[model samples]
Target: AAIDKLVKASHLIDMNDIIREGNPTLRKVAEEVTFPLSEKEEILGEKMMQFLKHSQDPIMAEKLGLRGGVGLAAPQLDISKRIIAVLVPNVEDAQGNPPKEAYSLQEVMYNPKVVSHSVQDAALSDGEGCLSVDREVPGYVVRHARVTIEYFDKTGEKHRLKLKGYNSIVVQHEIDHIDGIMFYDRINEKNPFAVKEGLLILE
Candidate 1:
């Protein structure tokens, strides 16, 4: 069914070949997308969104032997393009049910740069996970409490947005990929629970 999400025939429909953690490609610094996307870049962006959306579906993930993922980067797919796709999770209301509109699933960002970030640092209390990292890793990933980004959309239109809360964490994680960095790389290995002064714990 993922084939339906491919915008072009060039994209590898069977993501069975997605490179895993420690793969040389994942470690390489991703090249920025040419200002104007070539046919392949445009197709790749859409395909990445499709893969990410499908990966988030519990049924699709299980059926495809893939893990449920919220964010993905081009290098993860063996593509050197500096692009990332994210699916923000559903927000639950007071009634404990997810609202139908609290999502912007399958957002693709290209050549993103963090123009600014909050001085207040934060980390997810439970730690972070990556689709490429198959093993369970321990430790918290330090992140900014908020961030403002300047990036191009899939169509090469520039846009800016200030993000906070979980969105901030998700954006940072994906950007790390373009820079040849992984979430766990920022963890305090000597002391997994190392806490920084003035840092807040984000739920």
Candidate 2:
């Protein structure tokens, strides 16, 4: 089974395990994971985070033929569960100074949802991409500029976090996956690149 393969220590989640754009599972709303996560769920959470680390490592990413990613949702792996992992690096400054922290946000979120959000909308300056989406999708992926989210961890502990900027964008993208929404679905259908006035364009 895919879950069995995913939990195996010897296995690294490569592009093969990721379902693509046409997969029906991607459109299906994922199931909410209950408390007291199963052993498989716990292990899957750890493995998912590990995949992000591997993807971020220059040597490991090249060897595994992995695409660098900041976040991943379980549905992308064909597991229709509200499980997602995020690992966004705290980027260095323009002058090449190291970020005070190593990562902006790093965690395995279970049954995550946005509780509140700012009125202002935002989009990545370039655009957004997904492991499940292979082709280049141009234009903005509009999302809330700021958001307050809630989710549980593998330990079954609940957490509520407020996010903004790229952190907000990353979390919103993963949460959308569990709800059967694609990033492009929020793009302006008539003019994908049209940034409405007051929209924050994050570089």
Candidate 3:
């Protein structure tokens, strides 16, 4: 569902009115997320379920403005929590028996912290994409390599975790949003039409 429906949808893990240099709702920063769902929190639950389900739909994937989208945020859906959906690559432990490799999906997070990042950086995709930005995948200087993060689950369960490969990088991408930062913040400069123009421009 889009942000319109998200406003009234269920299980919202939103961070309403984030206070960041690019965002103007700085005054609303003090307001915490309001879980309006009563004992009948079904509305929120249903919406979240729909999001999780929709994440895998090819139709939704295509509608994403990016070449293909990366993680999507509650804000993109107009939900207020800091929660987001992430899909990372390269962290898999597929092994012989499994059908596919392992990957990490870091869902909604109220508060998050990236405890550590590996110095052994990876490539410069320069052409990346995300749901929040909806901007072309002029992906840029993303700190690649492994990382260790500490965060809580949607249930508020605490965790001190270690992530490697694409999984780690993807999680970092979403966490940046929670902290009021965007991907371009790490980029110095680049041609903006790379993704939108369907041209393979890498910096």
Please name the candidate that would achieve the greatest lDDT relative to the true structure. 2
The residue-by-residue lDDT of candidate 3 on 1-203, one tens digit each, is: 43344445343432222123344321122113334323222343344434544455567634531233335544444344455555442232456353254334635444456788766654345445544443454544445467887765545576787876556666777666655556676554564333332222223
Model 2: per-residue Cα lDDT over 1-203, one tens digit each:
77998998787887789999998988999999988999989998888898899999999999989999999999999999999999999988999999999999999999999999999999999899889887888999999999999999999999999999899999999999999999999999889899799999999
Better of 2 and 3 by lDDT: 2
**lDDT (0-100) at residue 118 of candidate 2?**
99
Per-residue lDDT over 1-203 for candidate 1, one digit per residue giving the tens place of the 0 to 100 score: 32233445754333565678878878888898887777767777777777776777787777666667778888887777689888887868898987887675447899987899999988999999887787888887998899999889967799889988888899899998998999888899798779988988887
Q: After superposition, how far is residue 93 of candidate 2 from its true place, in Å?
A: 3.7
TM-score of 1: 0.88
Q: What is the TM-score of each candidate against the true structure?
A: 0.88, 0.97, 0.59
- Candidate 1 lDDT at 36 equals 71
Instruction: Arrange candidates, best TM-score first.
Output: 2, 1, 3
* Inter-residue clash pairs, candidate 2: none
| For every candidate, C-alpha RMSD to the true structure in Å | 3.4, 1.1, 7.8
Off by over 4 Å in 1: 1-15, 94-97, 104-106
List the global CA lDDT of all models.
Answer: 0.80, 0.93, 0.48
Q: Candidate 1, residue 113: CA error in Å? A: 1.1
